[PDB]
Amino acid sequence: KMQYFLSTGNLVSQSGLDLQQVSGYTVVAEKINFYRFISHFRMVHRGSFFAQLKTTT
Amino acid sequence: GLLNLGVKDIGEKVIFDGKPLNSNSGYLGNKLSVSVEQVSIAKPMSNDGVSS
Amino acid sequence: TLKYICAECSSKLSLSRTDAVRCKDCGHRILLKARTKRLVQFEAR
Amino acid sequence: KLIGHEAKLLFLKSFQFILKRQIRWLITEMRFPKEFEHVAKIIWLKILKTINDQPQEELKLQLHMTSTISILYLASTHLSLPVYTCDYIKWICTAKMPYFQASEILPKSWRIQLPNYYVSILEGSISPFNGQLYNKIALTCGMIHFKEFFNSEISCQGLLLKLVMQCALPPEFYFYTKQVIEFEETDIRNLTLWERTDERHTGRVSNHAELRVLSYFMLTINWMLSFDRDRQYPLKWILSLTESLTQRTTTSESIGRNIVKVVYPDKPTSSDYFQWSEEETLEFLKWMEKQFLPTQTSMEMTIDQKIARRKLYKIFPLDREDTHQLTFIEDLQERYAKQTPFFPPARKEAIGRLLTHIASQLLVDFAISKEQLKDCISRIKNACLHR
RNA sequence: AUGCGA
DNA sequence: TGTCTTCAACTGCTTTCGCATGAAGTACCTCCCAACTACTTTTCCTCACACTTG
Numbered sequence: 001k002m003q004y005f006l007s008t009g010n011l012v013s014q015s016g017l018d019l020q021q022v023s024g025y026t027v028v029a030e031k032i033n034f035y036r037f038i039s040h041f042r043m044v045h046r047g048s049f050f051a052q053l054k055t056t057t
Numbered sequence: 058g059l060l061n062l063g064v065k066d067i068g069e070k071v072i073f074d075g076k077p078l079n080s081n082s083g084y085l086g087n088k089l090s091v092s093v094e095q096v097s098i099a100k101p102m103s104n105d106g107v108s109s
Numbered sequence: 110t111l112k113y114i115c116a117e118c119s120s121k122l123s124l125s126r127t128d129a130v131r132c133k134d135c136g137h138r139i140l141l142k143a144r145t146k147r148l149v150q151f152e153a154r
Numbered sequence: 155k156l157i158g159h160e161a162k163l164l165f166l167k168s169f170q171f172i173l174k175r176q177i178r179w180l181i182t183e184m185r186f187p188k189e190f191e192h193v194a195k196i197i198w199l200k201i202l203k204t205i206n207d208q209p210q211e212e213l214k215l216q217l218h219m220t221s222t223i224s225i226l227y228l229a230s231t232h233l234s235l236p237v238y239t240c241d242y243i244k245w246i247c248t249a250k251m252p253y254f255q256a257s258e259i260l261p262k263s264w265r266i267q268l269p270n271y272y273v274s275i276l277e278g279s280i281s282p283f284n285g286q287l288y289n290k291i292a293l294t295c296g297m298i299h300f301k302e303f304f305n306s307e308i309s310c311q312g313l314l315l316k317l318v319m320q321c322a323l324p325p326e327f328y329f330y331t332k333q334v335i336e337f338e339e340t341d342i343r344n345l346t347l348w349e350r351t352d353e354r355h356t357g358r359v360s361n362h363a364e365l366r367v368l369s370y371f372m373l374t375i376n377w378m379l380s381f382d383r384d385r386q387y388p389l390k391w392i393l394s395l396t397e398s399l400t401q402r403t404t405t406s407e408s409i410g411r412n413i414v415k416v417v418y419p420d421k422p423t424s425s426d427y428f429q430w431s432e433e434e435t436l437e438f439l440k441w442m443e444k445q446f447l448p449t450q451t452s453m454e455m456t457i458d459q460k461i462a463r464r465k466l467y468k469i470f471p472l473d474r475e476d477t478h479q480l481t482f483i484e485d486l487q488e489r490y491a492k493q494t495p496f497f498p499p500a501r502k503e504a505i506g507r508l509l510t511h512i513a514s515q516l517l518v519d520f521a522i523s524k525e526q527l528k529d530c531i532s533r534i535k536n537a538c539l540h541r
Numbered sequence: 542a543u544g545c546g547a
Numbered sequence: 548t549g550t551c552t553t554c555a556a557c558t559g560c561t562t563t564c565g566c567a568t569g570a571a572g573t574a575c576c577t578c579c580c581a582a583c584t585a586c587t588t589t590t591c592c593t594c595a596c597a598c599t600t601g
């Protein structure tokens with residue numbers, strides 16, 4: 001179950017973990033460049049749900 | 058570690074087999090408390106042909 | 110003699126259609142196909 | 155993987171094979187030219203002759219572990235090169251024969267030739283009990299009609315020599331016993347190998363010549379010793395021949411007899427097992443690290459079961475994590491000197507003391523019968539008193 | 542569908 | 548009897564065009580499979596007792 005969820009990033013549970021989305025939590029390390037590899041672990045996302053918002057505030 | 062606190066927080070899940078006994082008819086007398094005490098994680102290993 | 114190197118012991122070997130795909134010297138299950146004396150032409154650019 | 159007639163044919167074949175391998179080590183060990191080789195061939199050619207005749211679906215043949223040496227024994231007797239007990243002890247001690255394990259062959263494949271009420275039963279099933287050793291030599295003679303075919307069977311003035319030197323090399327006892335043999339021992343005539351005991355009950359008629367030779371040997375010592383009125387053999391002399399003997403190293407021989415003792419049979423040598431005079435202990439482990447390797451080579455097992463095994467041996471690795479010991483006639487000489495000092499109820503006891511010992515020795519090389527032996531003894535005892 | 546190039 | 552008014556629920560959309568590279572669900576069930584060990588299987592081998600003898 002944790003390989004599947006960790007292989008798709010569609011985390012679903014009976015509480016929703018109190019999180020605004022049920023996908024997108026996981027990303028490919030995409031080692032095409034050392035810059036990209038180190039940059040992945042210093043990247044932080046405001047979350048997809050705010051990506052859906054039309055505003056910019 | 059955080060995971061053992063989590064399993065210490067999930068506590069128990071109780072189920073009564075409808076303890077027939079023939080209070081013994083609405084107090085059942087059939088308690089089953091299922092829980093998880095510890096959670097262990099082991100480093101990756103592979104044994105082939107199984108165990109042996 | 111065709112060759113296959115064990116990915117984890119370096120030991121050279123020569124697999125056959127009649128043996129287990131495993132390093133007979135270590136027991137690994139991953140084998141690199143060895144390079145041989147085979148002609149390849151190259152334009153020097 | 156073959157059952158029935160053709161399964162038998164290669165069980166036949168394999169039997170064919172190992173005997174031949176047996177014979178050539180025979181030549182290397184004894185260097186007894188075309189002669190030893192060809193007589194042995196036709197002997198089994200003769201043996202094969204009969205197997206074909208009662209064929210149809212006759213499966214009584216598959217020879218025993220012993221039939222092969224009986225064959226080589228019969229052929230040698232023809233040639234009259236040696237002896238049985240000596241041959242057997244030598245063979246066990248040096249594994250000269252491939253007799254013990256049947257994996258050799260050239261079979262790899264004959265091995266797989268499945269077993270078919272056969273091939274698996276071949277090569278190294280068990281070690282001989284009592285006559286059993288001959289309980290087939292006679293049968294082979296039966297199959298062979300060997301006595302008519304081959305000259306001078308069971309004979310050998312060499313077994314007598316082997317026997318006197320065997321221990322109390324009392325030079326005079328050679329023709330003492332040769333003389334009693336001369337006497338009533340088949341009307342003063344060299345004992346010939348018994349007949350083709352055709353009957354399956356294999357009665358103990360004791361005609362196995364040697365068995366009687368050893369019997370005359372023992373008797374001779376007892377009688378001659380019992381009545382040496384002139385007192386040619388001193389009271390204190392008899393036990394000396396005992397003290398000197400009771401064990402000792404062996405320029406190969408005694409070490410061999412230990413190796414035969416270790417068939418742990420009727421417990422006459424079992425304890426020798428226990429005792430095993432220090433080094434005897436050591437040269438034993440030497441002969442195990444050399445001739446036990448003739449041991450073996452699990453199959454497939456992903457290399458796994460095997461590798462692990464290799465590692466384990468990698469582990470205890472070991473095998474080393476006057477040339478000292480002496481030859482046969484050296485030991486023989488030195489105990490003949492250890493008795494160097496030659497020139498009532500007690501001596502009788504000493505004599506019985508000594509006879510039990512030889513009974514141990516001669517009996518131990520052979521199928522014994524801690525009484526057939528003496529049954530045998532009893533027999534000629536009876537034979538004798540018709541003067 | 543995710544990330545992404547213009 | 549006839550006509551009018553507000554609110555809340557429901558409908559349909561709100562950048563284009565392509566690479567990648569497709570992968571992964573899953574309870575309930577399992578019969579098949581691989582295993583360790585023991586037990587069992589087919590052919591073969593070899594000795595043995597009694598009655599009677601003299």
Ligand SMILES: [Zn+2]
Pocket residue numbers: 115116117118119120132133134135136137
């Ligand atoms: Zn390896």
